[PDB]
Ligand binder design. Structure first.
Ligand SMILES: O=C(O)CNC(=O)C(=O)O
Ligand SMILES: [Mg+2]
Ligand code: NI
Ligand SMILES: [Zn+2]
Length: 331
């Protein structure tokens, strides 16, 4: 079995290997990359996402989210307080202000220590979940707006045509902005490109061990767990690496830098934080190997998780027994 310790793998495809996206995902899996839940892909030196980032300041962040924490430094939840609209240029200035800017630090490890010590005492503002793309239309390789759609993959595998669309999303971050522990909707893959700015640190649990994270989370957030049998779908819970290690949960960590892709694999729980002002683009995708994970994915039906239009058909076709309860949760 390849990669039996479930380490995060890093790939350096050649320009020729960068042509065929599906083929390269399958190659990475042939080497055991999916066992980690997360892989890094460094593009060939000949590639670029677009020519410059000099003209992005007028993008609007219609609903910036202030991420307010509750709990203790290593075990907390966050809620999202909606703020007034602002442009990317306004948000960049805010990120760089004395109130929000990255503190002085020695290296990524020092900054990680500072994150986990101090995150709960601040409320950073995240420009997350903005429909759109920063890839040039002429970028033909690994262009996240030109991937094969999940609806087409379902149709190709299973024969059933379904409604829905699959488009990317932009994330404008600042120091301490946080993504809570989660798997993707319907335990899909994700791919994330860090277009510009400061790094993003990731934590990940191997898919084969995801239920160990779920059992810990039920113990650590006992009210939330009574509320909902899949409350990690709410995307609000944080658990630090120190707490994971104290509880014997297998995990790994890695820092993504500008110009790098990350891929999350089906049922790979992940969480992390931004180092300073940055912009990422991400989208969900599927392969043939995903279908069995989609059929088995948990679902939130308590009302909280509320999701996109296109999840309806995935539940309806892959999980017909759960459909009626899940849809009640949507309504
Ligand atoms: O970058 C973020 O805030 C969160 N991203 C992801 O969870 C992802 O790409 O799958
Ligand atoms: Mg602009
Ligand atoms: Ni994700
Ligand atoms: Zn729920």
């Amino acid at each position: 079995a390849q990669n039996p310790n479930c380490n995060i793998m890093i790939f350096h495809p050649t320009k020729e290997e960068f042509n065929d996206f599906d083929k390269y995902i399958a190659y990475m899996e042939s080497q055991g990359a999916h066992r980690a839940g997360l892989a890094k892909i460094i593009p060939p030196k000949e590639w670029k996402a677009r020519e410059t980032y000099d003209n992005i300041s007028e993008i609007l962040i219609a609903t910036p989210l202030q991420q307010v924490a509750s709990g203790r430094a290593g075990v907390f939840t966050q809620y999202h307080k909606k703020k007034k609209a602002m442009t990317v240029g306004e948000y960049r200035h805010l990120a760089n202000s004395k109130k929000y800017q990255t503190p002085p630090h020695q290296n990524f490890e020092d900054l990680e220590r500072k994150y986990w010590k101090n995150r709960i005492y601040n409320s950073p503002i995240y420009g997350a979940d903005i429909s759109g793309s920063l890839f040039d239309e002429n970028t033909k390789q690994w262009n996240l707006g030109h991937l094969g759609t999940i609806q087409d993959l379902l149709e190709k595998e299973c024969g059933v045509v379904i409604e829905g669309v699959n488009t990317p999303y932009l994330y404008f971050g600042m120091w301490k902005t946080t993504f809570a522990w989660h798997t993707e909707d319907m335990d899909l893959y994700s791919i994330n490109y860090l277009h510009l700015g400061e790094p993003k640190t990731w934590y990940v649990v191997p898919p084969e061990h995801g239920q160990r994270l779920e059992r810990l989370a039920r113990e650590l957030f006992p009210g939330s767990s009574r509320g909902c049998g899949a409350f990690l779908r709410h995307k609000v819970a944080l658990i630090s690496p120190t707490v994971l290690k104290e509880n014997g949960i297998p995990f790994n960590r890695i820092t993504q830098e500008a110009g790098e892709f990350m891929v999350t694999f089906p049922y790979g729980y992940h969480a992390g934080f931004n180092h300073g002002f940055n912009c990422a683009e991400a989208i969900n995708f599927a392969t043939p190997r995903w279908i069995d994970y989609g059929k088995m994915a948990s679902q939130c039906s308590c009302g909280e998780a509320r999701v996109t239009f296109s999840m309806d058909a995935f539940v309806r076709i892959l999980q017909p027994e759960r459909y009626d309860l899940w849809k009640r949760g949507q309504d």
